[PDB]
Structure formats: C-alpha cells, structure tokens
Structure 1
C-alpha cells in the first residue's frame, strides 16, 4: 500500500483559487524510472496508461518489436506498485509486480484502472489497419483483463449491449479509467453506424466551446453548420465519431454486464481518445482534441444511476483557450473555426484547482500537463501550468526539434512535507534505444 505520506493526498483539488495564481513548476527531480525501456534501436514502446489511487498505482504500455506499426503482433507491459518517500524527500514509485502479456492476442489502445487489490485493463483486439475498422460493420473484439496483486489473472471477452450493429468500431481511450461506486469506468470512442438509434438521437447536435466566439471570424450560423458536420468522417467509413464511457461492474465473470454510455454531442466534441479522473467524489473527463478546436478539453461528468446501474452521463466543459496541440492542415494549433478535422495528439491535463469553487463554473481554472509547442509538428515537449487564458509557468524539455508524442499527467500531494508533485509521463523520441522512450518526468508544483 502507498506510504502514509500519500494515502490522503490523492485524487483531490490541491489548491484554492487564490493559490492557483501563484503556482510555478520546480526543477525536474531524479527518481528510478518505473517505465521499462526498449533494448533495440527499432523497438517501439507506446500508448501508456497510468492510474493512481489511494492504495496503489497501475501502469501499462504497448510494445511492438519492429517499428511502431502492426495490427497482428504486439505485447502489453503491465506494472503495479506503491509510492514511498526517498531520503531527499521526493517520491519513488516502487514496482511490486510486473506482467508482460505476450501471447498472440493483439491488444491495443488499452486503458488501465486501479481496482481494490489490483488493476483492471480494457483493450480491443486489432487485426487490421484502424481505418479498416471503421468500414467493417462488425466491431473489433473487446476485452477486459483483471490482474490481482495476488497474481490471479482473469481476462474476459465482453459484449456490452448496444454495440453490435451500432458501433462499427469501439476503442478504449487509453487514458486511465477510474473505480467509482463499485464500477470501473473507462473512456471510449469509435464510429457509429448511420441509421442506428444512437445516430438518430445524436442527429443535429453539436458543441462549441464558450471561448470560440471571440476568437472565430465566422458568424454564429456558419459556426453551427460546420460544428454539426465535424462529428461525421468520410475518411473513416462515413461513421459518426463518438466519445463515451464504458462502465463495468467489478466481477470476474464479465460477459455483457458492461454498459456503453455515449456523451451527448451537444456537450462534447467529436469523439477521440480520452481519460477519466476522480477529484473527491466528482468524475472528470479529458477529451483529446482530434477535431477543429485545438485547446485542452476537460469536463465535469455527472453520472446517473437507475436501479444500481449507470444509465446516463452529462458533461460540463471547463471553458478555456489554453494549451493548444499540433495539428495538420487547417486544423493546426492556430485554428479557431469549426469544420471537420481528424488530427491531433493526446495531451491530458490535471486540474490543480476546483472549477466548481467559482460562482460561474470554471471561470478561473488552473491546470498542469505537457504539450507539444508547435503548430503542426509533434515537437518541443513542454511541461506547464496554465489557467483559462494563459500559460503561467512552463519549461520545455530538450532542444527545439525534439520529437515527442502523448503526455499523461498526474498529481498528488505529500501530506507530510505538504508539497504537490506531478508526474508527466511523456513519449519521447529517442536516438539511442527504441523509437520512443516513455519517461515519467517528476517535479514539484510550488506555491509562490
């Protein structure tokens, strides 16, 4: 279990609105990395997922032997452990168990979540190029693996209702899932088939971030028209790209008890990878900006239960115009106008302040994470702290041109020294070993 110094400083808003204005990032601290490196120049480690809870943490990433492209073979590394203080005062992520799922099943886009006594992981089995998954009417096989600290492993092929003949494809969002009220929730996304109930119920819906108007040169009517069209992709089998949540009851005999809960397209942008968080008793969702709006998207999720089962989800966006991501064409970090786009990168963000603490939800929110500071290239990894309109502290890593990809950020507090630490898990392009080196950068978020 996690050390007493951390058991009470996890999954919370660590600072007050007033303190948020005076936060800065400290120097990077050196700790033994708990994320394994490749041992060949062409080895590829990508798509990490990290879940940290009161008792322990779970980590996982995908491994491909040659280069970063396969739809046949790949292995998935899973790791779990606890956090303990070092003599220097900062955290050490102690690995207590390691697993390497290597058996021929091509598990991809996996999201992992902490559960009492272990980790629950949700993956889908890839057997063809991503684009092909959208054209085929049949969805990929879905699997959830539960790995207990006692070394028992139970994997199940799941068939949640409302998937077959509704979703041409379904993928976990790769971002962490969360254990909530006896259920494990995972972010999901995919393509919905035209003519289905889901499609019809989503027809004509769209979402436009609160701060777009002042930055977009198009008129309201034009924005609305383009926003509505941004949820349909002709390149991806003419499917409605949808975001959502997969809720699974914690059982070892899962078959069709998990529930697919899609977000209303009136509250969320075009479906994309994502991540779920827990701040106290509130659930939050991070949605990758793979569409027209290039800024960080965070939402407070309200979950409704009907007869002990999740029946509906509602999302309220934290309005910002900060931390853009690199994109292609007319959808780069500089874009501000609605339209159809299918480009971007995963870059979640951690809320250091409570958006509900202001009279108007999210009027003054502070968050931290990493982002690729460029308009169209996945380059210049940069850790930062920002509010709705400005970056108030940042430090680029490496020299300009340094390639990087996804970035998963997680913060917790040492209730002993009373300082907040954040771990920025960044996929860095390496020139020595492997295509990428996923690094768990760690540093303090100083108040002052």
Structure 2
C-alpha cells in the first residue's frame, strides 16, 4: 500500500478552486457520513483537544492531545498522531483512510503541537510543558522545543531544537496549533511566544504596531491615541508585559536530522499580537492564518513571503487581506463586539480556507471568498456554523447541530475531485459530546456547490 491519495484528488489539493475573480453564490451540502478518522476519548471526562491537520498532495497528517483527566490538569498529556490517504467509496465521496498511527505516551507533556505533511510521513513541532502558560511568560528561558519525524516505514525520530534567534530574546515560545508546510526544501511551522522587552529583538521591535480598521465599523478616537493603544496591546500584563509575538520556525529539510532551525520574526507593523496560527501553501503562494487572540475580532489571513539567507538573517514580509465579515467570541473587553485596540488575551482558533486568490499576477481580487467553521456568538464558544464568506459579508451559513451546542477549535481544508469536479471541504471541529466529554473532534466532510 503506497502512501498515495486516490489519483482523482492529487491535482485538486492546495489549489485555488475559484480563479475567475467573479462573484459567486454558495451552498454547503449536508455532512457526508463515513468512519471518522479522528479518535474520540474513551471516558466521559477525559480531555481531547487541540487538533492539527494537513492534507498534502499524496497523503494527510493529523494530531491532537489526550489527557486522562479533566482539561484543567497538570500531570501530563499524550499526543495522538496519524497519517493516511483519501479513498473514494461507493457512497460517491472520499473518506480518510488511516494508514499509520503513533500514540506518543511516555510521560512527556508535549503541548500545543503543530503537524505538517512531509515526504513519506509527518513532522510535528511541540514544546514540553512543565508549568502554567503564564509561568512561561513570567520566566526568562523558553521551554524545551521538540521536533518529531514520523515516517511510513514506522521510523520515529525526536530531537530537541534551539532555533537561531531563540536564546536570549524570548521568555517562551510554543507552536501555533496549526499545520505547517513543506515548501522549497523548507519545513515551516507557525509559532508564537513572549519576547523579552529589554533583549536585542525587543529593542529592535519596540515601536512596531499594526492597527487594522474596519471602514464600516470604525473605532472612535484620534489617530495618535488609537495608535498608542494598539501598540500597548502587544504587551498584556496577563503575560507579564512581554511582547507577545508571532514567528515562524524554519528548518532545512535536507538537514532535518542535524539542523537547529531558525526563528523568522515578522515586523509587528504588518501583524497583530502573537497568537496561534497556520501556514498554507496554495498555488505555490504562502498564506498565514493568525488567531484573533488580540482586540481585533475579525478573521486574520496574510499573504506572506520569505527571503532566505545562508547566515541566519532570513526575513518574512506579510500583507494583510482586509477581512471584516464575521467576528470570533471573546470575553470582557475582547468580545466579538469590540473593535478598539486594547490589551487582550482572548478569542479562539478558527482558521479559514481561501477558495480564491487575493493578489494575483494581474491585480487584486476584491471578490475574495473563504470558507470555514465559526462560532455564532460574541462571548461564548458555542453554535458551530459552517460558512462561506466574502471580504465584507457572509455568503452562506449552515449550523452544525442544535443551538446551544458548545464548540471550540475549528480547522478547515478544501480540495477538489478532478474526476467529477466535486469540491469537498472538511471542517474539523472541537464539539462538546454528551458521552465523551470535552470535545469529540469531528471531521465534517461536505460538498460545496458554487454557482453564479
């Protein structure tokens, strides 16, 4: 059994499904039933959280975290990792056929793990948690960073890494809980953490800030006060006033057994407060989803591009796609109704799958469309809803379950059947279950109908 998807999907993966730059109407089909490839808990009160999923050209990779006790717990966790392929069934649609399983259960508390599809298997970026996240940010030395390689030949290799730029500049660093990508001999993971304000990186980036504005819902105040507030929002006292910063872990794949990798840190003039995220490669164009952990409540997706150097001076340039369609739930001054800059550590991971390019060779596509799963609430993680959205407004909505159903993290991936032109989107959602407790992570496969 080769680690190869069914041929009708190989050339419909990581492509822009809509490239006419025109307006379109959308319909989200009903969930297509199959044996779920994501295992649930086996107890009513075990914790099962933090999904990470990547569909590559030839196979997919998946992982999440399992705790034998309540989600509020400190002893340790375990990491379920799997890889598999897409197989067409006689029901008329594909299913995710698991081919390899690896349950990392050795007493090491690997946390916040991000997975990526690599030649012949998967790569996983974790940190080893030994204390509270707030303790991480209050300290001055980052936790242990681990890189795990899982191959189809059943080989597993785990290494501790110290990427260039980490030591001396960061109080803490964790993976972005969103899939990384394998791109031009580079393995790229999202990451975020706390930068020491007095360090070299802290002093260099001390005055960097980005303040997106919704023209239809502007924040009240003078430009200077809003800019000062947006700058202050990068240093929440909940995280000991560190500069909370997004970054990219970049590893040379050809040297993946010996390299320590490299931290590429974006300019905070182009990106908001560091948060969970995801790196996508569509039509050989790199995108970065950033969770709206800070005051800005709308969906954050950037077009990104790297400049790689031999000496360790790589850089990344980020370009925000102006999206103000829907808001994510948050608490206090950081709910979905807040649009003004303020110190926030709130929100929830909800990533988007872009169906259209935004920047193309001939210009910019204002008819941008993206799809995903949102939480229909401004304060609470509840009401999972499949959606297709434009830049300014929602195009179509389809709830999953009844109103009042609790849901948290969602990650969405779309691909096309090149045999019959069917467009499939899988919405992987943390759903509250009555029998397995905090989040059965469910992959809902639907067919997306696109018309004029």
Whether TM-score is above 0.5 comes out as yes
State the 1:12 CA deviation: 1.1
Separation (CA, whole Å) in 2 of partners of 1:430 and 1:283:
35
1:294 aligns to 2:297 (yes or no): yes
Report the 3-state secondary structure (helix = DSSP H, G, I; strand = E; otherwise coil) of the residue aligned with 2:28.
strand
State the 1:217 CA deviation: 2.1
**What residue in structure 1 maps to residue 331 of structure 2?**
328
Cα pair distance change 1:362/1:188, threshold 3 Å: farther
State the 1:410 CA deviation: 0.4
User: Which of 35, 52, 57 lines up with 1:49 in the alignment?
Assistant: 52
Q: Is the 8 A contact 2:251 2:259 kept in 1?
A: no
Report the 3-state secondary structure (helix = DSSP H, G, I; strand = E; otherwise coil) of the residue aligned with 2:227.
helix
**What residue in structure 2 maps to residue 219 of structure 1?**
222
Separation (CA, whole Å) in 1 of partners of 2:312 and 2:57:
24
Deviation digits for residues 18-67 of structure 1 (CA, Å, limit 9, x no counterpart): 55522221121112110001111011110010011101000000000111
**What residue in structure 2 maps to residue 97 of structure 1?**
100
State the 1:341 CA deviation: 1.0
Q: Is the 8 A contact 1:71 1:126 kept in 2?
A: no
**What residue in structure 2 maps to residue 232 of structure 1?**
235
Q: Is the 8 A contact 1:212 1:336 kept in 2?
A: no
Q: Is the 8 A contact 1:13 1:353 kept in 2?
A: yes
Q: Is the 8 A contact 2:308 2:315 kept in 1?
A: yes
**What residue in structure 1 maps to residue 212 of structure 2?**
209
1:70 aligns to 2:76 (yes or no): no
Q: Is the 8 A contact 2:197 2:206 kept in 1?
A: no
Separation (CA, whole Å) in 1 of partners of 2:417 and 2:186:
28
Report the 3-state secondary structure (helix = DSSP H, G, I; strand = E; otherwise coil) of the residue aligned with 1:165.
coil
State the 1:358 CA deviation: 8.7
**What residue in structure 1 maps to residue 91 of structure 2?**
88
User: Which of 377, 380, 385 lines up with 1:374 in the alignment?
Assistant: 377
State the 1:215 CA deviation: 2.2
Q: Is the 8 A contact 2:114 2:189 kept in 1?
A: yes
Report the 3-state secondary structure (helix = DSSP H, G, I; strand = E; otherwise coil) of the residue aligned with 2:207.
coil
State the 1:103 CA deviation: 0.3
Separation (CA, whole Å) in 2 of partners of 1:53 and 1:20:
28
What pairs with 1:6-45 in structure 2 (closer than 5 Å)?
Answer: 6-18=9-21, 20-45=23-48
**What residue in structure 2 maps to residue 338 of structure 1?**
341
Separation (CA, whole Å) in 2 of partners of 1:210 and 1:359:
26
Deviates more, 1:340-349 or 1:17-26: 17-26
1:191 aligns to 2:194 (yes or no): yes
Q: Is the 8 A contact 2:21 2:367 kept in 1?
A: no
Residues matched between the structures, number: 448
Cα pair distance change 1:387/1:422, threshold 3 Å: same
Separation (CA, whole Å) in 1 of partners of 2:204 and 2:20:
38
1:431 aligns to 2:434 (yes or no): yes
Report the 3-state secondary structure (helix = DSSP H, G, I; strand = E; otherwise coil) of the residue aligned with 1:330.
helix
State the 1:309 CA deviation: 6.7
State the 1:280 CA deviation: 1.2
Separation (CA, whole Å) in 2 of partners of 1:172 and 1:254:
19
Cα pair distance change 1:18/1:252, threshold 3 Å: closer
Deviation digits for residues 236-293 of structure 1 (CA, Å, limit 9, x no counterpart): 1221000011001225764553000111100000000000001111110000000011
**What residue in structure 2 maps to residue 160 of structure 1?**
163
**What residue in structure 2 maps to residue 393 of structure 1?**
396
Q: Is the 8 A contact 1:204 1:228 kept in 2?
A: yes
Q: Is the 8 A contact 1:319 1:362 kept in 2?
A: no
**What residue in structure 2 maps to residue 442 of structure 1?**
445
**What residue in structure 1 maps to residue 267 of structure 2?**
264
1:109 aligns to 2:123 (yes or no): no
Separation (CA, whole Å) in 1 of partners of 2:231 and 2:362:
30
**What residue in structure 2 maps to residue 148 of structure 1?**
151
Separation (CA, whole Å) in 2 of partners of 1:207 and 1:238:
18
Unaligned runs of 5+ in 2: none
Cα pair distance change 1:65/1:152, threshold 3 Å: same
User: Which of 178, 187, 191 lines up with 1:175 in the alignment?
Assistant: 178
**What residue in structure 1 maps to residue 134 of structure 2?**
131
Report the 3-state secondary structure (helix = DSSP H, G, I; strand = E; otherwise coil) of the residue aligned with 1:29.
coil
Q: Is the 8 A contact 1:154 1:252 kept in 2?
A: no
Report the 3-state secondary structure (helix = DSSP H, G, I; strand = E; otherwise coil) of the residue aligned with 1:244.
strand
Deviates more, 1:161-170 or 1:302-311: 302-311
Unaligned runs of 5+ in 1: none
TM-score (norm 2): 0.96
